[PDB]
């Protein structure tokens, strides 16, 4: 579960 960056 690659998680999108929080600034994405």
């Amino acid at each position, epitope marked *: 579960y690659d*998680v999108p960056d*929080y600034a994405s």
Partner: antibody
Amino acid sequence: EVQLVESGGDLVKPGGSLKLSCAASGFSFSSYGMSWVRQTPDKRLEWVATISNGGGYTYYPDSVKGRFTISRDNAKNTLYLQMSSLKSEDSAMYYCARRERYDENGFAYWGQGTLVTVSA
Amino acid sequence: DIVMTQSPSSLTVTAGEKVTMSCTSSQSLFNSGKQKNYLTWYQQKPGQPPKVLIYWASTRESGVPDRFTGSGSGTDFTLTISSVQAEDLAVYYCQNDYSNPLTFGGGTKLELKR
């Protein structure tokens, strides 16, 4: 101690390429995402590329797209920026800071840069 | 790019004196989702990689000495040392951490009165 340790920033002619590595400890690299950040000679620092914790999600500014690529290596447990087609204005110190996943609070952990100098 | 403006490029300061510094954004950094303006303040010394003092405008890092108060919300923002020390004379930056591209603010350098 988390430890990010950079290498690769040489003096290459513009139009050339440079690869940079950044080493990680004190955490499971796989859980957090890495970024590369440059500090220019007049000392403004600017975000070069951001990845995620395994890959896929690759992020860059428009200054960088085309030339640079951020990579990962979870067993060698190392972060790389492939920089290519070097303009002189790329000359900067390159830091691999990291992305604070759980908390959201910046770049609290920076390695101690690898100076990229591109000159003819 | 969400553009961060830091002012002033410098600020003189005696010691044991309250100093405030600023940053501003074109857009705003505040999301409703989490309920936070994502403007992180950094501090830097020659030789030294910058470090996180405040994150989310207002919230101080672990270790950051309590003189360091956060504020600013939306588009204009503030960095406030209630009582400056030798050990605080350094360049301070600000950053849109809200949304890519992550932009930082130009610089405000502390240099002390003589």
